[PDB]
Amino acid sequence: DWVIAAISCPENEKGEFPKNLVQIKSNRDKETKVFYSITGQGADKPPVGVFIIERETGWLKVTQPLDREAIAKYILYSHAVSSNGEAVEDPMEIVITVTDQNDNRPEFTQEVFEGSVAEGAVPGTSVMKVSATDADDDVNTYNAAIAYTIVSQDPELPHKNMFTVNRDTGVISVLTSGLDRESYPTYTLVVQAADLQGEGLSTTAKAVITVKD
């Protein structure tokens, strides 16, 4: 049997609802009056009534904005019943797919990441890793594509930029010489993760680095 494998709808649509999706009918409507209905989660099962079909015209519609991160795909079936009460078609599968918008900020997996480094470590020495996740669609968009940056370093001594971060991996490394346990044993870095390859929604966390012998 034929299936409508996808009718796409972006999440978070604005403007007037309901919105038309597609009109389906039985070509047996030349024989009898036919009445249309739909079943499935999103139709008669929870979330009830997100999708409706006009009983006489067969216009399938969506009645509220969708949310890809809650339900990304709805599987419905359309039904066609004559006025005398006989189903005149085998029910047809109709799938609604929800496309992504950038509506989730990245989140670091920890509020505070801890790491340590030997004071004599040569510039370039990898110290620790910070990590973030993003609930948006990393398959089809850059809405979940995170760039890591360092926002600040406390203290700014002996130099303001003792460390750097790999923009893609979140690995933090020694950038310059001068680390010294006896002068400054601890650094607090504010790190940022931002989606849209660093241009989008952002969040911060801390990396606390202990300088060892």
Q: Looking at 40-181, which runs of residues are DSSP E strands? A: 51-53, 59-62, 73-82, 92-99, 107-108, 112-118, 126-129, 132-133, 147-154, 163-165, 171-174
- 154 labelled ligand-binding: no
Residue 100 interacting entry, from a copy of itself, Ca ion, none, C-beta within 5 to 8 Å by type: Ca ion
> CA 70, CA 16: separation in Å to the nearest integer?
22
Task: Give me the least distance between CB of 20 and a copy of itself, in Å please.
Answer: 7
CB of 89 to a copy of itself, least distance (A): 6
Any binding-site annotation on 103?
Answer: yes
66 forms part of the interface with Ca ion (CB under 5 A): no
Residue 96 CB, nearest approach to Ca ion (Å): 15
Residues 88-127: x/- map of binding to Ca ion (CB under 5 A)? ------------x-xxx-----------------------
Which conformational region is residue 175 in: left (phi greater than 0), alpha (psi within -120 to 50 degrees), or beta? alpha
Interface residues for a copy of itself in 63-82 (CB under 8 A)?
78, 80
Cβ-based neighbours of 31, under 8 Å, separated by 6 or more: 82, 88
Output 24 or 191, the one with its CB closest to a copy of itself: 24
Give me Rg for the CA atoms of the chain.
Answer: 28
Give the three-state DSSP class for 27.
helix
3-state secondary structure of 61: strand
* Shortest distance (Å) from residue 26 CB to a copy of itself: 6
The verdict on whether omega for the bond into residue 158 sits within 30 degrees of 0, i.e. cis, is: yes
**Binding of a copy of itself by 92 (CB under 8 A):** yes
Considering CB under 5 A, how many residues would be counted as binding Ca ion? 12
Task: Tell whether residue 58 is a contact of a copy of itself (CB under 8 A).
Answer: yes
Please report, as ranges, the residues that interact with a copy of itself according to CB under 8 A.
1-8, 20, 22-28, 58-59, 78, 80, 89, 92-93
